[PDB]
Amino acid sequence: LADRFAELERRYDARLGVYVPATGTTAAIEYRADERFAFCSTFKAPLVAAVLHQNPLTHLDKLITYTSDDIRSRSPVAQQHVQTGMTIGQLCDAAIRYSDGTAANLLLADLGGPGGGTAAFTGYLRSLGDTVSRLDAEEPELNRDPPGDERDTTTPHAIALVLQQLVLGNALPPDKRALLTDWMARNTTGAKRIRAGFPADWKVIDKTGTGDYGRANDIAVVWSPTGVPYVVAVMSDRAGGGYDAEPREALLAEAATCVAGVLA
Ligand SMILES: *C(=O)N1C[C@H](NOS(=O)(=O)O)CC[C@H]1C(N)=O
Ligand SMILES: [Zn+2]
Ligand SMILES: [Zn+2]
């Protein structure tokens, strides 16, 4: 599978990272799995988990007020609710299903402490056993770190294990686990990434990320028709093309098609 992935890199003029944890009956899959890639919006999934972890469910009903000023990035939802504000739960919802920039920042602020909550967020990843990932900026900055910069990066290996713990493990109590899972299930932004590479009778829930330098990611939990779960982390960028390099969704879809062929 190493050969096919390399071929995808040259076919799409990109760097590709894949990680699929091993299961009782499937070997792990690994390609540049320990190389660093920018999070982009993929961090919003563990972010919601952080918020859920730190509070009882009733916190979800806490209304957050904000102004026009508090919108500095792509925020499809937060733009619509400026006059009323949004509850923590709505911000969680906006962050996973619409990748809303302000929603993510308001949740970072909810976590508390330095860096507008980025330190607390990294701390939470550390508490999960993730020694690799780091978040240093908020939106939109965190998507604009150049190649080579370590700020706001994870690895496929690291983020896959994190997602596994959160969705399939017991990092959260079942109630909180179901909310995170449910939100991810109702996301549609990933229809052309991992979802496109798996057969349509599989279940796929995911969180995407996109950025400069041809950056496109997708992190997913997938279930076979028989109810057999897997975790799939696919990350890419095209630094060779500079800031404006186009991201390629189809690279991720093809990568996923290879993964699916092995697991099916
Ligand atoms: C997250 O990566 N971002 C927020 C928004 N949604 O893109 S996503 O659906 O791929 O997550 C726009 C792109 C990106 C950003 N803030 O640049
Ligand atoms: Zn924990
Ligand atoms: Zn490791």
Residue numbers in the entry: 29 to 57, 59 to 83, 86 to 145, 145A, 145B, 145C, 145D, 146 to 238, ...
Give the exact sentences the study uses for this entry.
pmcAntibiotic resistance mediated by β-lactamase-producing bacteria has become one of the major threats to global health. This phenomenon has substantially reduced the efficacy of β-lactam drugs, which are the most commonly prescribed antibiotics worldwide. β-Lactamases (EC.3.5.2.6) are a group of enzymes that can hydrolyze the amide bond of the β-lactam ring, thus making the antibiotics inactive. One such residue, at position 105 (standard Ambler numbering), is suggested to play an important role in substrate discrimination of class A enzymes. Interestingly, BlaC, the β-lactamase from Mycobacterium tuberculosis, possesses Ile at this position, sparking the question about the evolutionary preference for this amino acid. Mutation of Ile105 to Arg in the β-lactamase BlaC simultaneously enhances activity for carbenicillin and the ability to evade clavulanic acid inhibition.
Unlike clavulanic acid, avibactam is a reversible covalent inhibitor and does not display secondary chemistry upon binding. Short soaking (∼10 min) did not reveal any detectable density for either of the inhibitors. In the crystal structure of the I105R variant in the complex with avibactam, the sulfate moiety of the carbamyl adduct of avibactam occupies the carboxylate binding pocket and engages in H-bonding with Ser130, Thr235, and Thr237. The electron density of the Arg105 side chain was missing, indicating elevated dynamics of this residue upon binding. The avibactam-bound structure showed an inward-oriented sulfate moiety of the carbamyl adduct, which is likely engaged in H-bonding with Ser130, Thr235, and Thr237. In all instances, this is speculated to be a stable inactive conformation of the inhibitor, which is substantially more resistant to hydrolysis than clavulanic acid. BlaC I105R is less sensitive to clavulanic acid and avibactam inhibition, although the effect is more prominent for the former inhibitor. The beneficial fitness of BlaC I105R correlates with an 8- and 4-fold increase in MIC values for clavulanic acid and avibactam, respectively.
